[PDB]
Design a protein around this ligand. Structure first.
Ligand SMILES: COC(=O)c1ccc(SCCc2ccccc2)c(S(N)(=O)=O)c1
Ligand SMILES: COC(=O)c1ccc(SCCc2ccccc2)c(S(N)(=O)=O)c1
Ligand SMILES: [Zn+2]
Ligand SMILES: [Zn+2]
Lengths: 240, 240
């Protein structure tokens, strides 16, 4: 029963853009090394809570000058047939799905030293919505979900352009301080939520929500935490 | 002799208010437990680089919701007769002196763990200027310098209200991330520089700069580092 999961400053949150603070010090995010060669392959796992892709060393992310991170992994949150499952909401709207790319501050060698430390971990988050076309970067992961239908299963996938899983607009985002959304829910996590969304086909969103199985003989669906109150935190925005 | 002194994100810096970014998310500083009783006494020490007062446990400081610190020590930077010695400057203007109250994040149990980690240490900085009245708060410290004029000397002083050494409006400050201004010049220090100043008499300012002796047979004077480039860092302001 991680006591951190009862902290005052938890994630995810409902983003109310009218209450967000415009902060012009929030510059465009910068990503280096995200365009991977096909080999070595990466490991894609059904962990019973999400599908998680382990990322290789060398993916560097900066929130700004002096604010440097390395990417660890990415995973997804999703709903069910006719039910949205983003973690974050905007003005109470929940989107079909959400991607999280979790990073470690370059000041720490291990996750366990960064847990609960200010700015020790940073998450990049983007909503997934339905578009008309099959998203080619997503297809490389989604086309392998059948291989990992079973809880605790994994498979290897070719490296891909990891930045193609995210929006092209890196300028416009909300940022706030919060927590991991799974035990141990440690605080001090810098959350960056893109304004622009990513487009998947209806078929892709259905593959995501209908393929994977979780604890027991239950479908892995609706794997989002309820929104947590801001409790006086102010969400910042990189635009007015 | 410490290559970190040549890092990219060093302190101090020149503040250019018109180029600061206003972020309404920067709330008034909260400083609790700073009104110390006369007992126990505190160590005041000439360390040959500054005069330093050791602070007891219980001085709690927050830069924002869930971003808490405990004060460790305070020290000063000053010039010489008719020469200002602040560390920060404002549009190129050097103030007569500067006070620094150094704090440790509650997320770290030791200073050595915090050095080089983002937001591990936070310093509150205020400019000291010349005014016509004698300053009662500062007198408690200045009146005791004669006793510690020898490099390496120390004395015990009565408890004092540390918060009385600071400016009037805790809602009005600049903020950026930089470094210690002495070796090891570690990065990831959050600097908060009050917009308003504190006034000492000309006599008090003279007492500060003229009583203490440093390494060799030289005066302890002009104990400030040269200003360092922002290198892309944007200074934030808590007010438009
Ligand atoms: C239902 O969602 C998940 O399965 C999930 C898994 C991991 C993580 S991050 C953990 C980083 C970590 C922590 C401890 C040890 C080693 C790695 C998150 S999140 N949304 O970013 O908080 C969700
Ligand atoms: C010439 O100036 C100084 O004497 C001076 C001394 C200490 C400090 S902070 C040290 C924090 C610390 C470091 C290591 C171990 C334990 C405490 C600073 S400053 N201006 O805050 O960078 C100036
Ligand atoms: Zn997540
Ligand atoms: Zn100092």
């Amino acid at each position: 029963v991680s006591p951190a999961c009862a902290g005052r400053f938890q994630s995810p949150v409902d983003i109310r853009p009218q209450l967000a603070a415009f902060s012009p010090a929030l510059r465009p995010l910068e990503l280096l090394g995200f365009q991977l060669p096909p080999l070595p392959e990466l490991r894609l796992r059904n962990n019973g809570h999400s599908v998680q892709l382990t990322l290789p060393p060398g993916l560097e992310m900066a929130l700004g000058p002096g604010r440097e991170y390395r990417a660890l992994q990415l995973h997804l949150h999703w709903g069910a047939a006719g039910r949205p499952g983003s973690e974050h909401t905007v003005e109470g709207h929940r989107f079909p799905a959400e991607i999280h790319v979790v990073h470690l501050s370059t000041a720490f060698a291990r996750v366990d030293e960064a847990l609960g430390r200010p700015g020790g971990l940073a998450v990049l988050a983007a909503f997934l919505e339905e578009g008309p076309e099959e998203n080619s970067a997503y297809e490389q992961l989604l086309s392998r979900l059948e291989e990992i239908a079973e809880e605790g299963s994994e498979t290897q996938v070719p490296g891909l352009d990891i930045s193609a899983l995210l929006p092209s607009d890196f300028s416009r985002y909300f940022q706030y301080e919060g927590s991991l959304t799974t035990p141990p829910c440690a605080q001090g996590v810098i959350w960056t939520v893109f304004q622009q969304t990513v487009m998947l086909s209806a078929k892709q969103l259905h593959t995501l929500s209908d393929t994977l199985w979780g604890p027991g003989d239950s479908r892995l669906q609706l794997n989002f935490r309820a929104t947590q109150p801001l409790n006086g935190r102010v969400i910042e925005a990189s635009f007015p």
